[PDB]
DNA sequence: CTCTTTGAGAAG
DNA sequence: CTTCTCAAAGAG
């Protein structure tokens, strides 16, 4: 049994973005999708990323509450 | 397990 | 400081 690390702003946005591409292109390797996702993320605005940062924070603050002695 | 991304948080 | 692991994803 293990408690996972909460998702960072990239990993929150990437989860839907990845699957949006995968649903069209199911034969594209997930290693290759990351490289596309990594490029796209570094082309987004502060406003575009903000919701994912706000959520990434929320996820982390929540997880710090739930797991106050989490070994990383 | 890897392969790849960013980014947190820890280690050296 | 750098440098490492893991979160997600799922096919090799």
UniProtKB/Swiss-Prot annotation:
Q: Where in the cell is it found?
A: Nucleus
PTM section of the record: Acetylated; acetylation impairs nuclear localization and ability to transactivate expression of target genes. Deacetylated by SIRT1. Phosphorylated on tyrosine residues; tyrosine dephosphorylation by PTPN11/SHP2 blocks SOX9 phosphorylation by PKA and subsequent SUMOylation.
In the record, the effect of residue 67 to P is given as: In CMD1; decreased 75% transactivational activity
Q: Quote the annotated effect of residue 67 to Q.
A: In CMD1; mild form overlapping with small patella syndrome; decreased 50% transactivational activity
Q: Which residues bind DNA?
A: 3-71
Q: Where is the composition biased (Basic and acidic residues)?
A: 58-72
What's the entry's take on its domains?
The transactivation domains TAM and TAC (for transactivation domain in the middle and at the C-terminus, respectively) are required to contact transcriptional coactivators and basal transcriptional machinery components and thereby induce gene transactivation.
Describe its function: Transcription factor that plays a key role in chondrocytes differentiation and skeletal development. Specifically binds the 5'-ACAAAG-3' DNA motif present in enhancers and super-enhancers and promotes expression of genes important for chondrogenesis, including cartilage matrix protein-coding genes COL2A1, COL4A2, COL9A1, COL11A2 and ACAN, SOX5 and SOX6. Also binds to some promoter regions. Plays a central role in successive steps of chondrocyte differentiation.
Query: What is the disease in the record?
Result: Campomelic dysplasia: A rare, often lethal, osteochondrodysplasia characterized by congenital bowing and angulation of long bones. Other skeletal defects include unusually small scapula, deformed pelvis and spine, and a missing pair of ribs. Craniofacial and ear defects are common. Most patients die soon after birth due to respiratory distress which has been attributed to hypoplasia of the tracheobronchial cartilage and small thoracic cage. Up to two-thirds of affected XY individuals have genital defects or may develop as phenotypic females.
| Subunit record text | Homodimer; homodimerization is required for activity. Interacts (via C-terminus) with ZNF219; forming a complex that binds to the COL2A1 promoter and activates COL2A1 expression. Interacts with DDRGK1. Interacts with EP300/p300. Interacts with beta-catenin (CTNNB1); inhibiting CTNNB1 activity by competing with the binding sites of TCF/LEF within CTNNB1.
Q: What is this protein called?
A: Transcription factor SOX-9
- The stretch of the full-length protein covered here is 103 to 174 of 509
């Amino acid at each position: 049994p293990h408690v996972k690390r909460p998702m960072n702003a990239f990993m929150v946005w990437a989860q839907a973005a990845r699957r949006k591409l995968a649903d069209q292109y199911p034969h594209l390797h997930n290693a290759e999708l990351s490289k596309t996702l990594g490029k796209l993320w570094r082309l987004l605005n502060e406003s575009e990323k903000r919701p994912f940062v706000e959520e990434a924070e929320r996820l982390r603050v929540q997880h710090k509450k739930d797991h106050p002695d989490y070994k990383y």
